[PDB]
Amino acid sequence: HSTAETTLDSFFSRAGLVGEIDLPLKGTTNPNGYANWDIDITGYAQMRRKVELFTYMRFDAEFTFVACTPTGEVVPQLLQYMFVPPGAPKPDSRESLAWQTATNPSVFVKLSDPPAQVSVPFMSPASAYQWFYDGNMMGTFSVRTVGTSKSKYPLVVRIYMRMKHVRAWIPRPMRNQNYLFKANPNYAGNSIKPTGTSRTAITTL
Amino acid sequence: HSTAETTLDSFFSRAGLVGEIDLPLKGTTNPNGYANWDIDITGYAQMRRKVELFTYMRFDAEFTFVACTPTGEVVPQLLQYMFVPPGAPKPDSRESLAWQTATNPSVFVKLSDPPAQVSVPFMSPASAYQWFYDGNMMGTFSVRTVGTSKSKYPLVVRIYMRMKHVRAWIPRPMRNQNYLFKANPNYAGNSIKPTGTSRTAITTL
Amino acid sequence: IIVGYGEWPSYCVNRFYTLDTKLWEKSSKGWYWKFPDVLTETGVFGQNAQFHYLYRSGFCIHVQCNASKFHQGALLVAVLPEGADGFELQHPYVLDAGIPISQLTVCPHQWINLRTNNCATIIVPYINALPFDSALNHCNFGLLVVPISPLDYDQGATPVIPITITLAPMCSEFA
Amino acid sequence: IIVGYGEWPSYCVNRFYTLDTKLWEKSSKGWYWKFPDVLTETGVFGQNAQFHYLYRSGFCIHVQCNASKFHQGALLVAVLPEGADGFELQHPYVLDAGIPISQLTVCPHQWINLRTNNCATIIVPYINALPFDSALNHCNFGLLVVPISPLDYDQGATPVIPITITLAPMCSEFA
Amino acid sequence: GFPTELKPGTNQFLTTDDGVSAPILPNFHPTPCIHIPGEVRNLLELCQVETILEVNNVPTNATSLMERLRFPVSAQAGKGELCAVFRADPGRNGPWQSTLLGQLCGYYTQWSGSLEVTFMFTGSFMATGKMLIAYTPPGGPLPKDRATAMLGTHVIWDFGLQSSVTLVIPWISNTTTGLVSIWYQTNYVVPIGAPNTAYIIALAAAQKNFTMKLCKDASDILQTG
Amino acid sequence: GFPTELKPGTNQFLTTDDGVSAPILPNFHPTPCIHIPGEVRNLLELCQVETILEVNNVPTNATSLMERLRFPVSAQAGKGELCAVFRADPGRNGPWQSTLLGQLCGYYTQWSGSLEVTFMFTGSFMATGKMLIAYTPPGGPLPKDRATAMLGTHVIWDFGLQSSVTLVIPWISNTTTGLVSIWYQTNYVVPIGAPNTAYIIALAAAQKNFTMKLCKDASDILQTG
Amino acid sequence: GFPTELKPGTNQFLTTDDGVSAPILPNFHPTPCIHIPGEVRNLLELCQV
């Protein structure tokens, strides 16, 4: 719409796969039928370099839950998908009393349904999230299969996130070197690369 | 919304698990295919101390019925879920004539559906429910599987309740000691605990 | 003067009833009275309480004590909704009901500090979830008098301090 | 004069603080200072920084150097949000943070070319995601002085060029 | 027919939702509501009511639980001596856990605002003396003596002229903390025939700018039966 | 009931869609937004900021990476001699890959508009000389000598009168390219006691008519850890 | 198409409900109603006899 695609609404505008948890029928990955997943936005591999063009941001989030068999099959199972706000305790087992605390909101849904979809607001104590602190908790999704016994099907749950109502302040230079850690600007000082490609002489095309 | 979360509308505002009845295929828990459940609001374990901050209350209720297999599986079964008002007789067997009395409202629903959901109004002969009487029937839900023979599946039915249109009068001190009974303020007099924690000296932090 | 919950008694035995004197010592726990149970035996009010079917009334309560300037102590007088010589508290810390005494100031209350004053006055309206009840089967509220800071004196002074309750019925009905 | 981000300091130790002189050679990498860490030890500002709980202040920075007409070189002075003798850059190409120096002109900046000028001035407002923070636990921004084109001269001239930083606090609060 | 297309949030049950469901008893008429005194409609009305602050949370036996509600002042203790200290945190474990403000903020996560503490002297009419109640902001330590505590926010409280003093604590926040300490200015003066020991009762509440947010039904110790 | 008929796009999840979903925390109130300086709301504001163009992308060692940001002018090189060449393509691999314009157009596919290149002479005050910066349109080759480059779009830049010159490149487009070359008009004149070698720093940006379209999260080399 | 989302009370049959269903005989005309004496329309009229 005559430069409405370079706005920050359009630059952060699609649902990307962040987070993928697996509930196997046998093994040691998740031996019981539950899993915890802390909300980070940098599980999508192209996302950390984009948000670190700025210093402060402020947005809302929208989550979508699609689930299936490792082959891709759709089976009649019921799941729970509850949200633990920041500052609240998290479940330890399947018989924890945190699964039925009314201040942790849940979404009961069958596996033969459209994917579940919820919205999470801005929840920081400050006025913005900051990606650089010289001197950012959103919550946790717990995923369980409903029952007193173990389920009969292996399941995989994938989580998608779209950001909305985006504002940003104070642009910064973009990332030049490969990352090594999380929330940490360290780099490999014994191998520093140029920003782009090279040529043989300054007078040769 | 600038202190709209400390109102009594928000303080009593979520659907919590109260009541959970089981219809086994074999055993002695419920040998036939029916069960009765008397409506109390204190089946949610955090609820009795909250409502007893006040003396009189007045509210509406909204019930939701989600049901499944002990594993979590969804099977093609049809159930009945009827409501017996206070002052009406309750079923004795599966061949009782109370299951087909037209003044007891029913909700026929398949198990492969969204959960059923109904609303129950204020039904006391007085002007408010009172939690303390120095000197509160809401009804009964009966749950049966539809048929003349016994069903082929073990089933578990869970009941959720959200209160609405809440008013309250005359605040009281909150509960200090552990409970022993229902609708009874008795306590263990041979073991009385302080309200909080202690320290060694009054001049030491 | 404390008017309970910001509301006066109103329509939907007009005399003073000085009950009796309690004796406050160095080892007292506290006392309670149940209304209208305290008054269904004395006078004209005790006749109309047990000869009629329905009842509606408000009250006005005066609590007084008299001591010298060499005595010290403090009492908390409170009114909590839901004989004529009262009962004694066994466990005053949990108010014999499992609720703390340190939060009893959420009720219509008044302090008596012997250093400052010697009288308390609380006005109570009619409170029920019904417009009319029975005086003999339902007690509306209770009156609590608990010493928070204990009585003290030096040896030779009067060891026992009187506490007198006097009350007046206000806007009563009987049917 | 550069006013950072188009905004002046404003309300929600009014003197010049000439820090010290750096020495710029033919093999210098660059320097950085952290604010308000550079000033929590000197003068009246250093007392009110560590005796109060909350802090809010803007600044005005002057960077000067003096040389003859037979010297050449260029410096880039910049301010990037997030002692009193500074630190030296080890890897000035990645700014010791993994970000390129060729894009540092997206910040409030100013050039010093010895052929043309000898002074730079940047005004910095108060920037935080909070209205008040701690001066001792949080540094707001850093000042960068990096030679892009290196110093040069012929042998016999003065081999070392002075660089002096002087600053003035502007619209400070303490609570 | 009217074309629809059924978005991906359809057959789900979210427990924090709010809609209109089917009433099972239509054309039934409930009992009308009479006037009852004492209607509460916001919980911030109840945070503004003074309740007893158990500064003296030392004894633990059952026959000495009423001694937690008062703290002594005697005549055998010299001048410049510390009497009692406590923090200014309504949501943490300690003295504030007996107030109604400290119990209602156990159902929430975040709070901020101003407080107020009232002290009540319950000695005899014939006794005199002075006290020093001080307040230290968050970050600074407890003072070492009466002289450095006087160099700060404080008040002198005289027994012979006034039986109650109040102390407005400024902004506490964020779910370190401030400190309140009581010192002896003078000694405890008394005539012949009056007792040598008195007690002080502390009462605490909140101001009109206090707020709470992010509700949390915290798992209480109070278990049913 | 109201008749509907459920068109063939119903139970699908399209990842580029935009609707309104259910908020899990109703009547929760977020923190209000204070004023913070430096708010960006379009990425074309950032394409108009001058950054350093690494024309001298020859050295590759780690201790010589700062030499990529400047290119020499000496006194031992005669008149009419070529100094440096580079293309005018912000989106391709080469000198433009160090600018912020060349990094932001790696997130898009198509672009078109005008550019601007600024040159800065950082020699001593006592040095003089002249240069020739030329521009060749797309299609024509590099010129063979100083005389044929003068027959075209060019500028003469004098050191002794002016320390900075600018060159507005007209329309580049379409995701051959133009050429910019620097020639020596005269020699490098210097007195006794001044250095014989200077350096030039190039800065590049875009004009107000530059646009980008068809977004593409291109798989960067920058991998996480 | 118009987006809908199907709340949890959909495919149920509540016996105390009241809606509008499909008439199986459209454009059939019933017999008009004549005046008959003694019409009752509330049961509290009969409690007063």
Where along chain D do its domains lie? 1-175
CA A68/CA A158 separation, integer angstroms: 9
Q: Does B108 touch chain C (CB under 8 A)?
A: no
Q: Does B195 touch chain C (CB under 8 A)?
A: yes
* Contact between residue B60 and residue B123 where contact means Cβ atoms under 8 Å apart: no
In angstroms, the Cα distances linking E170 to B61, E166, E173 are: 42, 13, 10
Q: Return the SS3 of A164.
A: strand
**Which of A:144-203 have CB within 8 Å of E?**
none
Q: From the CA of C67, how many Å to the nearest CA of chain B?
A: 32
Q: Please count the other Cβ atoms lying within 10 Å of the Cβ belonging to residue B23.
A: 23
Closest CA to F111 of F91, F138, F81, F139: F91
φ, ψ (nearest 5 deg) of residue F103: -90, -30
CA A155/CA C49 separation, integer angstroms: 72
- CA E131, E134, E139 angle in degrees (round to 5)? 160
Interchain contact, F29 vs B10, CB within 8 Å: no
Q: Please count the other Cβ atoms lying within 10 Å of the Cβ belonging to residue D163.
A: 20
> Given its phi and psi angles, is residue F147 left (phi above 0), alpha (psi -120 to 50 degrees) or beta?
alpha
* Contact between residue B99 and residue E48 where contact means Cβ atoms under 8 Å apart: no
Quick one: A133 exposed, middle or buried, by C-beta within 10 A (0-12, 13-18, 19+)? exposed
Quick one: F188 exposed, middle or buried, by C-beta within 10 A (0-12, 13-18, 19+)? buried
Q: Which residue of B has its CA nearest to C140?
A: B134
Q: Which two tokens stand for residue E221?
A: 């110790």
Residues of G in contact with F4 (CB under 8 A): 4
* Contact between residue A104 and residue A113 where contact means Cβ atoms under 8 Å apart: no
Closest CA to B36 of B21, B18, B15, B56: B21
CA F155/CA F169 separation, integer angstroms: 12
Residues of B in contact with G16 (CB under 8 A): 105
F112: Cβ contacts below 8 Å, ≥ 6 apart: F171, F172, F173, F174, F210, F211
B148: Cβ contacts below 8 Å, ≥ 6 apart: none
Q: Which residue of E has its CA nearest to C71?
A: E124
CA D39/CA D31 separation, integer angstroms: 17
Q: Does B11 touch chain F (CB under 8 A)?
A: no
Q: Which two tokens stand for residue D161?
A: 């060029």
Q: From the CA of F197, how many Å to the nearest CA of chain D?
A: 9
Residues of G in contact with E25 (CB under 8 A): 16
Closest CA to F175 of F113, F219, F118, F95: F113
Which of B117, B119, B162 is the best substitution to test chain G (most G C-beta atoms within 10 A)? B117
Q: Does B187 touch chain C (CB under 8 A)?
A: yes
Interchain contact, F223 vs A195, CB within 8 Å: no
**F51 closest CB neighbour out of D105, D129, D156:** D105
CA F143/CA F125 separation, integer angstroms: 32
Query: How many CB contacts within 8 angstroms connect chain E with chain G?
Result: 37
CA F114/CA F211 separation, integer angstroms: 10
* Contact between residue E159 and residue E123 where contact means Cβ atoms under 8 Å apart: yes
**Which of B:108-147 have CB within 8 Å of G?**
108-110, 113-118
In angstroms, the Cα distances linking F132 to F118, F157, F212 are: 14, 6, 32
> Given its phi and psi angles, is residue F25 left (phi above 0), alpha (psi -120 to 50 degrees) or beta?
beta
- Say how many CA atoms lie within 13 Å of A46 toward its Cβ: 13
Strand order in the sheet with D2-3: D2-3, D119-124, D55-65, D161-174, D17-24
* Contact between residue F46 and residue F104 where contact means Cβ atoms under 8 Å apart: yes
CA G33/CA G18 separation, integer angstroms: 25
SS3 content of chain E, % helix, strand, coil (to 5): 10, 35, 55
The counts of H helices and E strands in chain F are 2, 12
Residues of G in contact with F9 (CB under 8 A): 1
F57: Cβ contacts below 8 Å, ≥ 6 apart: A194, A196, A197, A198, A199, F68, F94, F95
CA E60/CA E55 separation, integer angstroms: 14
Which of A127, A172, A177 is the best substitution to test chain D (most D C-beta atoms within 10 A)? A172
Q: Which two tokens stand for residue C151?
A: 């009585």
Chains G and E make contact, 3+ CB pairs within 8 Å: yes
**C105 closest CB neighbour out of E50, E124, E193:** E50
| C-to-N gaps above 2.5 Å in chain D, after residues | 12, 82
Bridge partners, D24 (sequence order): D161
CA G22/CA A177 separation, integer angstroms: 70
Q: Does B170 touch chain C (CB under 8 A)?
A: yes
Residues of F in contact with G19 (CB under 8 A): 1
Show the domains of chain E with their CATH numbers.
1-225 (2.60.120.20)
What sign has the CA pseudo-torsion E99, E101, E105, E111?
negative
Bridge partners, A67 (sequence order): A157
Q: Does B6 touch chain F (CB under 8 A)?
A: no
CA B136/CA B183 separation, integer angstroms: 11
Helix extents (H) in chain C: 43-50
- Say how many CA atoms lie within 13 Å of C143 toward its Cβ: 27
In angstroms, the Cα distances linking D4 to B42, D7, D78, D102 are: 61, 6, 10, 19
Q: Which two tokens stand for residue A61?
A: 């989030």
Interchain contact, E43 vs B54, CB within 8 Å: no
CA F97/CA F120 separation, integer angstroms: 20
Q: Which two tokens stand for residue F82?
A: 């070529």
**E217 closest CB neighbour out of A64, A102, A108:** A102
Interchain contact, E10 vs G8, CB within 8 Å: no
Closest CA to C145 of C70, C52, C42, C61: C61
Interchain contact, F10 vs G1, CB within 8 Å: yes
CA B199/CA E85 separation, integer angstroms: 12
Interchain contact, E122 vs C72, CB within 8 Å: yes
CA E127/CA E198 separation, integer angstroms: 9
Interchain contact, G16 vs E6, CB within 8 Å: no
DSSP state of D6: G
Residues in chain C: 175
What sign has the CA pseudo-torsion E8, E14, E17, E21?
positive
Q: Which two tokens stand for residue B124?
A: 């006391």
F interface residues, B as partner, C-beta within 8 Å: 27-29
Q: Return the SS3 of F153.
A: strand
CA B138/CA B61 separation, integer angstroms: 10
**Which of B:21-60 have CB within 8 Å of E?**
42, 45-46, 48-49, 54, 56, 58
DSSP state of B37: E
Q: From the CA of D103, how many Å to the nearest CA of chain E?
A: 39
**A167 closest CB neighbour out of F39, F42, F87:** F39
* Contact between residue A61 and residue A120 where contact means Cβ atoms under 8 Å apart: yes
Closest CA to F6 of A113, G21, G2: G2
CA F133/CA F183 separation, integer angstroms: 6
Quick one: G43 exposed, middle or buried, by C-beta within 10 A (0-12, 13-18, 19+)? exposed
Torsion on CA atoms A86, A89, A92, A94, rounded to nearest 10: -90
Closest CA to C4 of C174, C172, C170, C146: C170
Chains C and D make contact, 3+ CB pairs within 8 Å: no
Q: Which residue of E has its CA nearest to C131?
A: E34
Which of B1, B103, B138, B195 is the best substitution to test chain E (most E C-beta atoms within 10 A)? B195
Closest CA to B69 of B28, B26, B22: B22
Helix extents (H) in A60-137: none
Q: Which two tokens stand for residue B33?
A: 């295919």
Kind plus residue range of the DSSP H or E element containing A51? helix A48-51
Q: From the CA of G15, how many Å to the nearest CA of chain B?
A: 6
Q: Which two tokens stand for residue F179?
A: 């050429």
Distance of CA F203 to the CA centre of its chain: 8
Q: What CATH number matches the domain at D1-175, 3.50.50.60, 3.40.50.10330, 2.60.120.20, 2.60.40.1760?
A: 2.60.120.20
Bridge partners, F131 (sequence order): F157, F184
Closest CA to E9 of A164, F65, F12: F12
**G6 closest CB neighbour out of B108, B114, B118:** B114
